[PDB]
Nucleic acid binder design. Structure first.
Ligand SMILES: [K+]
Ligand SMILES: [K+]
Ligand SMILES: [K+]
Ligand SMILES: [K+]
Lengths: 850, 850
DNA sequence: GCCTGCACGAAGTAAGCATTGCTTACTTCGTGCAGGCACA
DNA sequence: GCCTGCACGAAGTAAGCAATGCTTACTTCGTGCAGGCACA
């Protein structure tokens, strides 16, 4: 039953006892490991050195057991299986230590281990009840242990006196002591074999085992009493005690080396301390007591129960956590009076839910627990059953109301399900779990038969019904049929086009269902689109495929140029390989004709006309007057960095200053033509919205009502437009009726900044500082945004550095890896050594790779 | 604005108009595809045959447009951009058809397409406003279209009379008709180029475009009026009309072939009708009006709104569904007076939530929508803001109550969060979304600072806090530190052992966290266990590894035998390869010595003694009496199928009948020894629990209280035990205070059958029919369970056929694939041809592989 | 709305990661019988 | 509780799939201007 012991001593004595007990545990672990070696290999069983090691481990276990509680006061209230060993020792003539008198019994260590707070996970087992294969006399061994005779306990099999083993009688006659008839009858049987089991001595005599053994005290009758009378009359040798205490530690650490030697000899692998601990756990977890300890540990760790209360609960409920969690509070108090209400709430989650989340008294919670066991039990019980139990007076008012509210809460948490509809569903189908199961079974018509179960209720209840009913032409019964046939929306989406056509679905319905509109725009065949979705997934992944892989899949060159979005002037000037490479390396044809040289364009296979077309439209315009020459027009555009306004700006004399090989006669004509062009250009886009145009634009953006509300609030549409152009988010929001889904509709980029976690004021500051979200992404530095009051998390989120910061990198280093490289994928596949060059640890680079 | 038209005709006329409009749509699709070919490749643009094909498509589009509304009565109330074209045609002298007079305008088809219910998804575009590259005279073309002159509209570019194109004046002078001064001023410009744009004619004359065009009626001034006066004075040729009607269909289906030919010539790929529709959509979805149609279609399909109401909503709110979902009901009623309240609830999910789930009037719901836009908007707003708005009278009582209840419900749905604690959290942190964000940020101390936020609340709120706090020795602050450092419980679990040790975690804590207890039992090193978890995953996968792979990883042979659980009698008799193969092929040494022959065991390298030990314990007993011979003992055991009771049962004379080579003298001794052994066996296990033993067993299983409760409900603990042995689940459950988590504790196998979806009565029947769940799995057939009243779904669940039925296979075929094979993995990797042998489709086999 | 392609900006949309919920042997846990590792 | 290894049964536990929720450019959507497809 109860194993308990309380340590009442100083910190010094506490450390002494902990060290002694841990060393004894190591000794008994050596015992068990030697037994495992004996049984694991018959070749090891043949070895006599292994038997000597086993006996030496037994001797050291006994020696360490003798050193426990030397002052006879470190332990009190020692209990072993309900038996109070304190009063049992007090009733003995020679008194002694209750701790040592407890360890000599089976599993007595469980008491002492609780007094010293030794981690019960590693099974701190110490047993000194060896009979067969014991180097000493068993009863003498146990008596020496219980009397704490560290001087008489040998520390080596070679130092074992024959008067303590085979010739034990020589030690008895040396100290006289009276011997009664029962003890002589036991001794005349032990003379045949001193290691005879006490069961055999009791059977070959007609006595009980308790009669043969007797109390471990001189004033008794039995072999224990005889050895007690013999040992009491022996003086305490201080010299041998000190020398054994000094020797035994090195002796144990040497026996472990011998054990590892024998394990290497017979198993070719060692026996780790961790392995020995795990083996002890796995060989002793079979019996309850170990399951009780494991359950009490689980309670202490997960629910924070005190040690003694958790142990008592585990004893009372066979170490079953679920059993304790389905037990009412009054029963838990009956079995454990020291249990607190908070502890019971922590263990019984149903009790805590009722009491705290529903304001029930512990007695009403006990009512609900006794009648329905758990919250899931309540959710399983029909509503009519609870109503009947309430109307018959078998269920209190508060308990009934709380149970009904729990059942209703399980259904009202779905969108569209009110309380009247939840009650109707509970009346029609009994319990919320039955409703959930009917929803899983796609019983759409059965649920729709209930009053108030509309489209919203079905879409919130039946998984995937929304996705199918929203398709044009798919009826409710058709959606139910599809869901029941294929088994969920996922399996209907994974169905092939042929079997979907056999069911009567339109090709448009199948396209909408499988999401193939983009691949239908790419390839005019539905089956090939579905097969591409199967093989690669998204249409973007097909667009990212190399040219060679696309050619093999059955694509023409024009189809590849259309898929990758290659411009006409770029797809006609070069072949697919070079055009696609230039496009996926520079992005825009403008960048192609601005970063590459005219000679470079020609060398790649471009017609001079095509190469001029690839060059900017100003390049085609420079050569359209007096033939300034491509070699010279390219340098002219490289000066102003491809800008007609920069060309029309400066004085002609500055041209020959910047561009070499340019005469000043052509410079004036260049500037004149550039000014003419910039005057002809700024005459088309010279537009500022009028009043009516601003009014119509507002009505289009935020709708009629909010538009006229804003117009009245700020005066005219012009003021609203001025606020929009200046990104006056705060001024727009103060109007009642204008929210984020309207400001973001008016101010481009507001929604993205809001989804990044920025407050409207912060987003307003950012928009005023940088102009738009794009300019923020390709321009803002973390310190810059830190000056605007943004936290590092918001900065990382808005700059696109989420993946890099997820690798446990700060925002500054992530922005540097984005600056000195390219995108995130550019750092994902990066020179592993160059990252170490930048001062990143190997662990940081490994996390970058992950 | 509004595009609308109502069809007022017979079913025959309806089909006629649908066919005519679809043919015109195909013609205009050909027009657009020819333009795409002209623009896509300059080589195709150089081709004159492609230009002739384009002009032929234009002519056929015009011819089909002339055939719309022939009886002049099929359409009424034709509206194009708010302009009612019915009254506009009625005010003209020559009257005519409103449909044709609408089609000649930009996007006029949108009206007629709504009258004929043509699928607007495919963009039924019909335009006859071609100027450049028009084979006829543009104004003459449009007038012929508006007057429905199918006879005068040519069907081939070669059939174009010069008096209708370049020499158009010849057709004018042929019919006299007065010409005013403005029309002569337009004609003297058209004599230069008949295809001059009307914008150019208005600019090079000083008039407006409407002044140059004029009304399409004789009583007007303009080129339209001139051509109207010319065309009205021409008789309708019935012969040419009939002949064009007969030709145009074949002509169009031939022009499509010419288009495919040119596309193969210039693109090496064809133009599918689906591709053409998708390209038309992608080039016309850019303009607003098409977005309006797409939004109205989305409304009709997803929310079941009537066509006209959805169209009006899409027009009024720029085709944005989100704007409509954030628009109050009164505004929607203002823009659409015909809108019903149910439609508004279906489109605005927040409105529906408020009205139905909270019983608010439409005005209170509109209040909440205006102030917070959405339910998520309410969840984002601080509670103090709503309190201020209510106390200032700017928020009605009902709206404030509903908002507070929404905010509170967002937190009470988490276990451990009551209402007082939810209110305290909302006061401390403003809004529930802020609380969720603080929980994601692992701000555990900040949340714990609020009164009533205990361990359960934190575990329900902070993701992964439960997994870390439940570990022995990990404090709350330590768990917060780990979660903030690595970023979630997953990243703490993915952390290496080295960095976890650097953080101060015990090796036991790291083992508990990373789940390496089994791999710690296998390998006594934590780092190697972690590396094995990284490489292979689960310890069972390492156990399943072949012997050679285990040897290379650094395992000894004894370590491998321990990993795979090889018995001693099996690991010592053979080598590692053969022993491991026999164990992974037969599972138990009993099955080894039962399925294999004694000679087969000897041939594999087993000692006769070891081979007898591998044989069943009865094999060692038959040879222990009179030396019956292994060759004969094997047949004796093969007769009774390895059963001592079957041997002791029958008469000795039946032995020589079954086993050949057996004398009748040995048969009597065999039966005698078998009866002696079976009598000596049933004398040790002959145990049936007494009353006190049943009481103690009940107290152990279901606890003291429920045990005495059951004892009081029935006669004695013996009756409870009798009910348990017979699996009387129903009679045990009827006891008040006994639930599923106690019956399942009493009746082994009940929990598994319940988790399979079986009712207590069904689980009771199954347990009574088969004895235990194991016997059900390895013995019950689907038809048998169907006889017991179980549905096929429950049968699939209980028999382990979930994976096979998920492949859209019925329970019978899945059970057959489990019978005629092995496990589910045996069907996963199966002969693909042998599955076709059993009558499975290729799709079924493909799903089996997946 | 001339007619769209090239091009850019960015959230509208929806791919993709993460979390959460359900199912089941996927793995761990509890029990019993022989006979050795060895008795209250 | 002799002692534990072999072995089976099964839910206790927790791997593994499924659905749901969050974040963000991941993929589409909306807009503008150039110059041709080519004009109220
Ligand atoms: K803890
Ligand atoms: K529908
Ligand atoms: K506001
Ligand atoms: K009950």
């Amino acid at each position: 039953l109860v194993y308990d012991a309380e340590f009442v001593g100083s910190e010094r004595e506490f450390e002494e006892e902990r060290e002694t007990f841990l060393k004894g545990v190591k000794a008994y672990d050596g015992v068990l490991a030697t037994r495992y070696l004996m049984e694991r290999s018959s070749s090891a069983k043949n070895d006599e050195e292994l038997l000597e090691l086993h006996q030496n481990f037994i001797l050291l276990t006994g020696s360490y057991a003798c050193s426990i509680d030397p002052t006879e006061d470190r332990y009190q209230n020692v209990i072993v299986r309900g038996v109070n060993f304190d009063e049992r020792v007090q009733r003995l003539s020679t008194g002694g230590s209750p701790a040592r008198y407890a360890i000599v019994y089976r599993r007595g260590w469980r008491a002492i281990a609780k007094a010293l707070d030794i981690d019960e996970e590693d099974v701190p087992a110490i047993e000194v009840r060896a009979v067969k294969r014991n180097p000493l006399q068993p009863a003498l061994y146990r008596i020496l242990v219980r009397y704490g005779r560290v001087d008489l306990m040998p520390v080596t099999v070679d130092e074992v006196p024959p008067e303590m083993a085979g010739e034990f009688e020589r030690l008895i006659e040396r100290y006289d002591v009276p011997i009664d008839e029962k003890e002589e009858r036991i001794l005349e049987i032990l003379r045949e074999n001193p290691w005879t089991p006490h069961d055999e001595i009791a059977r070959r005599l007609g006595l009980s085992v308790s009669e043969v053994e007797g109390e471990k005290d001189p004033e008794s009758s039995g072999i224990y009493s005889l050895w007690s009378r013999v040992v009491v009359n022996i003086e305490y040798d201080e010299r041998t005690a000190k020398r054994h205490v000094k020797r035994r530690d090195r002796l144990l650490e040497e026996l472990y080396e011998h054990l590892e030697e024998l394990s290497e000899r017979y198993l070719r692998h060692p026996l780790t301390r961790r392995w020995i601990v795990e083996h002890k756990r796995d060989i002793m977890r079979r019996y309850l007591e170990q399951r009780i300890v494991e359950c009490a540990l689980k309670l202490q760790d997960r629910y924070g129960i005190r040690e003694d209360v958790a142990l008592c609960l585990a004893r009372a409920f066979d170490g079953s956590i679920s059993m304790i969690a389905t037990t009412p509070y009054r029963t838990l108090k009956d079995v454990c009076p020291d249990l607190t209400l908070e502890e019971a709430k922590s263990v019984n989650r149903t009790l805590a839910t009722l009491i705290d989340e529903h304001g029930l008294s512990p007695d009403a919670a006990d009512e609900l627990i006794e009648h329905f066991e758990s919250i899931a039990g309540i959710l399983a019980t029909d509503l009519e059953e609870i109503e009947r139990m309430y109307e018959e007076g078998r269920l209190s008012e508060e308990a009934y109301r709380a149970a009904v509210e729990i059942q209703l809460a399980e259904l009202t948490k779905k969108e569209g399900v009110g309380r009247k509809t939840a009650e109707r569903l509970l009346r029609a189908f009994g319990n919320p779990e039955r409703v959930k199961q009917l929803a899983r079974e796609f019983e759409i018509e059965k649920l729709a038969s209930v009053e108030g179960v509309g489209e919203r209720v079905l879409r919130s209840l039946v998984p995937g019904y929304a996705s199918l009913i929203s398709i044009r032409g798919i009826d409710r019964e058709r959606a139910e049929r599809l869901l029941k046939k294929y088994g969920g929306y996922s399996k209907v989406r994974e169905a092939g086009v042929e079997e979907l056509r056999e069911d009567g679905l339109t090709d448009a319905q199948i396209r909408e269902l499988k999401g193939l509109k983009t691949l239908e725009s790419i390839v005019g065949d539905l089956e090939k689109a579905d097969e591409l979705k199967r093989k690669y997934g998204s249409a973007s992944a097909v667009r990212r495929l190399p040219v060679e892989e696309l050619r093999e899949l059955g694509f023409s060159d024009d189809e590849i140029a259309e898929i990758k979005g290659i411009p006409k002037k770029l797809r006609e000037a070069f072949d697919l390989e070079t055009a696609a490479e230039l496009y996926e390396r520079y992005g825009s044809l403008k960048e192609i004709g601005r970063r590459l040289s005219y000679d470079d364009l020609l060398e790649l296979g471009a017609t001079p006309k095509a190469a001029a077309e690839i060059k900017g439209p100003e390049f085609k315009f420079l050569l359209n007057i007096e033939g300034v020459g491509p070699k010279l027009a390219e340098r002219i555009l490289e000066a102003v960095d491809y800008d007609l306004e920069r060309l029309a700006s400066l004085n002609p004399e500055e041209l020959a200053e910047k561009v070499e090989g340019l005469g000043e006669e052509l410079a004036e004509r260049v500037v004149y033509a550039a000014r003419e062009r910039v005057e002809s250009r700024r005459k088309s886009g010279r537009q500022e919205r009028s009043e009516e145009e601003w009014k119509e634009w507002l009505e289009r953006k935020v709708g009629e009502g909010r538009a006229r509300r804003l117009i009245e609030y700020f005066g005219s549409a012009g003021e609203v437009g001025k606020l929009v152009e200046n990104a006056e988010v705060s001024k727009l929001l103060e109007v009642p009726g204008i929210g984020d889904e309207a400001v973001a509709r008016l101010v481009p980029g507001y929604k993205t900044l809001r989804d990044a976690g920025l407050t409207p004021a912060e987003a307003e500051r950012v928009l005023k500082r940088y102009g738009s979200v794009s300019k923020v992404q390709e321009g803002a530095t973390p310190d810059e945004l830190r000056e605007l009051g943004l936290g590092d998390a918001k900065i990382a989120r808005i700059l696109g550095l989420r993946s890099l910061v997820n690798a446990r990198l700060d925002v500054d280093t992530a922005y540097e890896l984005a600056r000195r490289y390219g995108s995130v994928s550019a750092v994902r596949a990066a020179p592993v050594a160059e990252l170490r060059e930048l001062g990143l640890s190997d662990r940081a680079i490994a996390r970058i790779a992950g």
